[PDB]
Amino acid sequence: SMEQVAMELRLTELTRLLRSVLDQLQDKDPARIFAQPVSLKEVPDYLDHIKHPMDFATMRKRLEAQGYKNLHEFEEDFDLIIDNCMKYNARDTVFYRAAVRLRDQGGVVLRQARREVDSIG
Ligand code: NA
């Protein structure tokens, strides 16, 4: 059906916008602290602590499968990256501080993305 096609084209355009958002967020992490999963071979107890690990590579895989149906889903995954880091790492660490800074800087990017998704439909 043509209605199915139109929904597919909308998902594709959202995916395109979310790619640009993901690139912009990742630019705010030049140290690449959040680029890849935590290795369970190097914080071996990680999964006793953190139930839903998340990272930018994992988000990118979901995005390339058009796996985010709306901006809220994408934001939830970004917030997991931040939130997991602020739980596992103490307030005095470079990791926790990097999460705070990414949150602050990412807020700006996400604020405009919400306006563009609403505005374009
Ligand atoms: Na903590």
Side-chain angles (χ1 to χ4, degrees), residues 38-40 42-49:
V38 171
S39 187
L40 306 181
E42 330 158 307
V43 177
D45 77 350
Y46 194 69
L47 299 180
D48 299 335
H49 295 264

Side-chain angles (χ1 to χ4, degrees), residues 4-6 8 11-15 17-20:
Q4 286 304 313
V5 165
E8 293 170 5
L11 175 62
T12 297
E13 281 309 307
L14 174 63
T15 302
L17 179 160
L18 296 179
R19 189 163 320 112
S20 163

